[PDB]
């Protein structure tokens with residue numbers, strides 16, 4: 001039993017990983033699965049930052 | 055100042071000497087005027103220039119903060135991160151402010167020194183051919199025309215001649 005945030009007592013817990021080239025990811029589930037549709041290729045690596053600002 | 059010349063036995067500077075930091079004022083029958091001692095002056099300009107660049111360049115490598123975020127149950131390391139970044143900023147702020155204070159004092163004294171040395175340079179040429187008045191000035195026993203004056207500024211003042 002959980003308090004209602006945005007009118008929901010259910011929750012979603014999200015996970016991630018970096019799948020390296022030539023490697024495979026394997027899923028198995030009975031239910032409650034939030035499956036990937038789209039994933040992001042990392043094409044350009046370099047200098048960046050997340051800047052907090054209004 | 056440490057060397058006693060600037061705002062010391064030389065009471066004040068000269069608005070009328072525009073062309074250099076240190077120099078001479080002459081007064082004889084032909085007239086009077088200011089003349090900058092360029093060499094002493096250029097020496098000072100090279101030293102101060104080097105100083106500024108030395109200061110700027112020494113502060114070149116210095117702490118750069120990066121953004122790092124932490125969840126609600128990572129308060130300890132969040133605090134650590136903050137104390138760490140603030141700590142380095144305070145250290146570099148101290149270094150910068152103290153360097154400026156210390157080197158400002160040395161710059162003012164440096165000028166005082168250059169004046170004292172220019173005064174002694176002239177004193178050591180003239181020796182007992184002039185009265186040391188005690189205010190930066192030397193009153194000649196002989197007439198000293200413009201070529202005579204120039205030889206004082208030269209380093210060429212022929213003492214045995216007078």
Ligand SMILES: *[C@@H]1O[C@H](CO)[C@@H](O[C@@H]2O[C@H](CO)[C@@H](O)[C@H](O)[C@H]2NC(C)=O)[C@H](O)[C@H]1NC(C)=O
Nearest residue numbers: 017018019020021022023024025026027039041
């Ligand atoms: C898919 O994943 C498999 C292993 O789970 C990867 O292994 C490659 O597969 C072939 C075998 O048929 C090898 O000859 C290749 O050398 C592997 N390729 C590379 C580039 O290492 C498989 O490569 C992946 N599929 C691809 C690359 O099409």
Ligand SMILES: *[C@H]1O[C@H](CO)[C@@H](O[C@@H]2O[C@H](CO)[C@@H](O)[C@H](O)[C@H]2NC(C)=O)[C@H](O)[C@H]1NC(C)=O
Nearest residue numbers: 200201202203204205206207208209210211212
């Ligand atoms: C400094 O000044 C003195 C005096 O002006 C110079 O000696 C004279 O030099 C001129 C021009 O070279 C000659 O024509 C005169 O015969 C010299 N007279 C006397 C009384 O010295 C000296 O050459 C200068 N030295 C410098 C600029 O280093």
